[PDB]
Design a protein around this ligand. Structure first.
Ligand code: HEM
Ligand SMILES: *[C@@H]1O[C@H](CO)[C@@H](O)[C@H](O)[C@H]1NC(C)=O
Ligand SMILES: [Ca+2]
Ligand SMILES: [Ca+2]
Length: 294
């Protein structure tokens, strides 16, 4: 029931407003564009794209923020707050947090050089959150190719699309604690690549130490992610699992040689993710504050 022109009459300038907030936020911090995109992913994979990941914990409620894959990982909440506030003065109670999260993800990719896609709008916000689902549904970086396939299959994604979506790691950064085991106890990685990574990612401590996902173009949305994979320069265990004599090898090679096919396929995959269990019609609500239920 989602449409790109959903806010055409209700709030004509909503999209422009969102693009502007994102553009400056990602200009001050390139990484922000990656945080926001990921934020949308963490929203959609846990009980639909309903902004459930934005609800703060309270005296009688526990959201998704403390979930294993969320705690100390996901960021961007502040940026979303100001985007919401601006749109609220523009047209009170029209634009939902769920849609904002979907647009921000898109504008961020574009700000970082990626190809834009038509975002479908019309999602409503939830009154609930699932800590448990956040823990189980979201993939872990130590998963093997089969496990990743299962994880995406549960949401209706195919192996190819999994490869397509992992491309999102063409921008952003990961904490040392997320790849430490790889650069030390793994062999399928360029020795020199590992060596340097061992420097700013001690086997003992320094968990917080961040390192780029795409060493070639850390903050530019392109197909370089796949090029790294071929040259065994993947950051996470889950990253190299796509190019290691397995089924996904061909797709990785296809993407590394043709950037356009990646750009196109990614947009389509994002639109698909944006359609994960949405609340529409009159169900849910248009939160005035993305951190709390009305
Ligand atoms: C294929 C399985 C995937 C796994 C196992 C996974 C896991 C991770 C982990 C461990 C981090 C870093 C967390 C931290 O250290 O704080 C991360 C970052 C990131 N991921 Fe994924 N991810 C996957 C899929 C995706 C998808 C499909 C998207 C969404 C389109 C995405 C977008 C990003 C972005 C852009 C970052 C960087 C965030 C930032 O710099 O703030 N990831 N991912
Ligand atoms: C991943 O694969 C390795 C080698 O088959 C295996 O030892 C390990 O237990 C697997 N872990 C997961 C989470 O699948
Ligand atoms: Ca959700
Ligand atoms: Ca890149």
């Amino acid at each position: 029931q989602l449409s790109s022109n959903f806010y055409a009459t209700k709030c004509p300038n909503a999209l422009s407003t969102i693009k502007s907030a994102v553009n400056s936020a990602v200009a001050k911090e390139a990484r922000m564009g990656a945080s926001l995109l990921r934020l949308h992913f963490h929203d959609c994979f846990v009980q639909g794209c309903d902004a459930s990941v934005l609800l703060d914990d309270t005296s009688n409620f526990t959201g998704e923020k403390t979930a294993g894959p969320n705690a100390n990982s996901i960021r961007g909440f502040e940026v979303i707050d100001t985007i919401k506030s601006q749109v609220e003065s523009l047209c009170p109670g029209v634009v939902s947090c769920a849609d904002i999260l979907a647009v921000a993800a898109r504008d961020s990719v574009v700000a970082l050089g990626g190809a834009s896609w038509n975002v479908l709008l019309g999602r409503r916000d939830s009154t609930t959150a699932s800590l448990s689902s956040a823990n189980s549904d979201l993939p872990a970086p130590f998963f093997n190719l089969s496990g990743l396939i299962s994880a995406f299959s549960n949401k209706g994604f195919t192996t190819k699309e999994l490869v397509t979506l992992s491309g999102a790691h063409t921008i952003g950064q990961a904490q040392c604690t997320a790849f430490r085991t790889r650069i030390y106890n793994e062999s399928n990685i360029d020795p020199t690549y590992a060596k340097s990574l061992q420097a700013n990612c001690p086997s003992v401590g320094g968990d917080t130490n961040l390192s780029p996902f795409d060493v070639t173009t850390p903050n530019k949305f392109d197909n370089a992610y796949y090029i790294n994979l071929r040259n065994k320069k993947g950051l996470l265990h889950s990253d190299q699992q796509l190019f290691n004599g397995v089924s996904t090898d061909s797709q990785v090679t296809a993407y590394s040689n043709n950037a356009a096919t990646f750009n196109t396929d990614f947009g389509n995959a994002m639109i698909k993710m944006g359609n994960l269990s949405p609340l529409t019609g009159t169900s849910g609500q248009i939160r005035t504050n993305c951190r709390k239920t009305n």
